[PDB]
Amino acid sequence: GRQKARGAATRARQKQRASLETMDKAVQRFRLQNPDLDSEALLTLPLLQLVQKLQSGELSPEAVFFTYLGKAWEVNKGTNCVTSYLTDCETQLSQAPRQGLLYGVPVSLKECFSYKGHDSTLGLSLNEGMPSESDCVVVQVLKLQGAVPFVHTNVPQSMFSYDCSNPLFGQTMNPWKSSKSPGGSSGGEGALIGSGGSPLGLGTDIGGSIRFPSAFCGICGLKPTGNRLSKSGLKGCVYGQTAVQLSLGPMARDVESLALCLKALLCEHLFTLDPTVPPLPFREEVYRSSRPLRVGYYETDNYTMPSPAMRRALIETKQRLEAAGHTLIPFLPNNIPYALEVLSTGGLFSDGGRSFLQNFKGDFVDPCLGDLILILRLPSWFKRLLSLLLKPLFPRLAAFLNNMRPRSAEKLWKLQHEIEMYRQSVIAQWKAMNLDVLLTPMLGPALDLNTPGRATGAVSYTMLYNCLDFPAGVVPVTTVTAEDDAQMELYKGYFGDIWDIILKKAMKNSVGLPVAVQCVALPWQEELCLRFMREVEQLMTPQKQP
Amino acid sequence: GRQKARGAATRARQKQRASLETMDKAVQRFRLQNPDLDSEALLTLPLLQLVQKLQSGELSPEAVFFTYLGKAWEVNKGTNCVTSYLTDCETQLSQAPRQGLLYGVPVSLKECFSYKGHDSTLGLSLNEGMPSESDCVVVQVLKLQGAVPFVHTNVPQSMFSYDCSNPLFGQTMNPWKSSKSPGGSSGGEGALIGSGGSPLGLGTDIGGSIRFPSAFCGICGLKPTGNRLSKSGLKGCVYGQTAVQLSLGPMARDVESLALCLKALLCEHLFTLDPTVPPLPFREEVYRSSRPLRVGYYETDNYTMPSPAMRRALIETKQRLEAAGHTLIPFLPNNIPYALEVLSTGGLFSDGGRSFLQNFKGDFVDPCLGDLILILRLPSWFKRLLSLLLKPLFPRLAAFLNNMRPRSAEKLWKLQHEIEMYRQSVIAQWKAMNLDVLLTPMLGPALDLNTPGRATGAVSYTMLYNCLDFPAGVVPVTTVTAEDDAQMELYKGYFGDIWDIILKKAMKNSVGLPVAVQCVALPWQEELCLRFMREVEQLMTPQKQ
């Protein structure tokens, strides 16, 4: 009963292979004509510098484009992050608006950013051979700003996962260690940007999907307020779920690139192409501010025990923020377990997962999804009974299961109102301490391939901020030491359930992997959040290229 | 079992009575100290000039406040629009921030704008004797801008109505004609502002509730995009419904007053007090633009037959815009019957009315609600059966009834997605004609008392824009002539169902009543919408500017 799904996989792998072949040919031809180009100097230029030399005419767009193309092709060899070469991008190159803020910049796109003539499969059989009629809005805006979107990058099947494998294009690997997940669902971006194959990409995030891959692969990512940027024309898999909104945002090698991307997207072109997005221009004066901050912080959410490296990462950042004159205030949003188990999970699965499951009918289920599909398929009464049996021993498992049940419109209204009140509760708590921003641990180091799907509880650090719909970003601040890695051996977790047990095993053998912290500000405060992310980057990686 | 509802009404009426008495004494006390005050001239100043005089010192806040207070008390005699005098507002008056953009302006509040120490009953027994414990955010911002909120005004019971009666405070009457509804649910505001008792107020709107009372009473009103202004701290009766967007906004005697109010609300105070609102400052330059406009228009929505006065109002306004060099382009949002019957109604009533109905347990149901409560109370199977029976002769009634049935979360997601797709579809139409703004009929003239609850169909002109969540304001442009009124005898409606029959009768006997047009722009374009409203006001009623 999988013939259709096998045929879709066969055609998708053939398209991926042919894309890669096309990229290689274009690259080899370019290198023939240009044997004297210093490609290493060009590839190691920070985006802002890259942009400046593209604008001044010191670098040609062709040079930058084919140099990134070959790098992307090369890093793909060991990561399998690229699903499709966006075909006509060479012609887009020659027609790029010369005064665009991203003129001549190659940009990589997560597969869900619809690009005319191309599938956005999400790794799902039912989406194969359905090429988009047109570019999504953000892609249009990138082009109107002179950028050159050039590849679609891999995502885990359906995107509802923080790993990164699907039955069409297979598994994407972390560039730091191939037995490690790159994170997800923007895992292709994480792996590609993290190994130098792209200077800028866009991802999406409903529970951490920009933040996980950024942290796991050692790059910067920002998830803005859900409606800060346009979602018009994006390929999705669940429609009309609005309790927990999806957010899209940039990933890149440094904080300044995230700021440039946001500044480029937040222009009249975006606001007129999608009038539903509030026309809030990028406030540069807020981003470039350098006043002392009141910084709320916590070392642990009391839900996911942090790895020793996560905890050290957080504490060292707190300490340097304090040495730099900031005020560090202990702070923890109230009722995190409610936010995760009841509001987030309830919001995401208000219908018991039926709408989500339509996607999987007649399809393989990628091992990286774990038992998610099997669990969602259980009848409501059975989820209920099983939840009751589990409650005494494993309350966390029980609480998630009970909240993944279908319910009436009436109860959805009640849930939406609760999400709304919880958001005001945390806003009030934040204002009572007069915080400017909030510093939190970020999940890391990277988990073994195919383990994120068995360690659901670990979305706690990021998913809290989709529930709250606050802008939240991540910045790499350290790498796992031998001592961090040895101490991980005593890791117990707060619950001792299967999620805690998997997390300890999945983080084994991590010496050298990047570890991040998370930076949060209030709704619509992307500029302040980025200002704070820049501060953490200046202090924790003082040797990063200007 | 009605002892509780009766008790609630007795207490509410005694409170209202004590408030009016407190106002009377304050007013008389002031008048004795100020015998030479030209009250008429003060009451007549357009708000803009009033603000300017208060800021310079030419007028004292006390003179402005007590003069409006006496006017409010006088006009309430014949309208019953005031439910409560906001007690401490006299102290607020002496403390108003001197540089506030609304320094010394008295502001009237629809009863649902929570105000510390005061009930927001919504005309419901279960809310009586349960005072708010804090000002809602917009009241806070008004006060931080130096304004003096001074009264709560009446609403129809629960607010789900475009009439204005409840069993607690009773019935509000149109100030132009006592047999007429002032509209609603922001009806107390329309009646108070429209009779000169308040220079500025705030209403709310989920299907027209700012626009109905504005049109019916002859004043200007704006329903912004749902999340342009903070709803934080408002009193409601249905919580968590997000398919069809609730909006709050200003009502006033002229367009400039709405623009001033928005400019004062859209400040740092608002944006820090409620970070969930996008911090979009009022773009003065967009509001002040005098560039020619591409104005889409329609003179009927093919759902509610416009009255002859509505029709003429629309066409005359169209012709004056053409004469002033604007480009008038025929435009009708696609699939209106679907947007109204499936999306809007299904959105408002996704749970079959069960949450709404909880508010009425143990309470009288005001006659102005008509059969709404009785209908919502019916078992889903029976709504469905009755819908089948009506379908062949009365498709509209059948459609509303079927779409007011409860459903699963899964069905609500599907509806939400359809709403989102529908909104993009109208945006796409608008883009393909390169419109700046859209001009539509506004329901009018005012309906007879106790008939809006029996003519649900007539919400079509306004509710479409809550569904789409576009900013939409109305501007008075003409008044009903005997000619317009006699032509009501030829009005048939497009459907001939009970709604069309009720509406035909209810709109008669309206000679001399105000009639408006509606002005619409794209989401977040309140300033452009106001720019257009200003244009209409200037071309049809030059005296306002």
Ligand SMILES: *[C@](=O)([C][C]C1=[C][C]=C(C2=[C][C]=[C][C]=[C]2)[C]=[C]1)C1=N[C]=C(C2=NC(C([O])=O)=[C][C]=[C]2)O1
């Ligand atoms: C990522 O943010 C997904 C990360 C993630 C979120 C939630 C869970 C989870 C929570 C509770 C129980 C089981 C699993 C695990 C991992 C991301 N990126 C996109 C999406 C997403 N997009 C759509 C859409 O339609 O565009 C729908 C669902 C998810 O999630």
Ligand SMILES: *[C@](=O)([C][C]C1=[C][C]=C(C2=[C][C]=[C][C]=[C]2)[C]=[C]1)C1=N[C]=C(C2=NC(C([O])=O)=[C][C]=[C]2)O1
């Ligand atoms: C007004 O906009 C009410 C005008 C109105 C809207 C809809 C209907 C209707 C539609 C279909 C079937 C039956 C009736 C009739 C009149 C207004 N102002 C506030 C509200 C409102 N507020 C809340 C809340 O909780 O704040 C809830 C419901 C309605 O409606």
Ligand SMILES: CCCCCCCCCCCCO
């Ligand atoms: C929950 C605490 C507030 C209850 C006090 C009395 C109720 C006043 C209602 C006005 C505010 C609407 O949310």
Ligand SMILES: [Cl-]
């Ligand atoms: Cl919004």
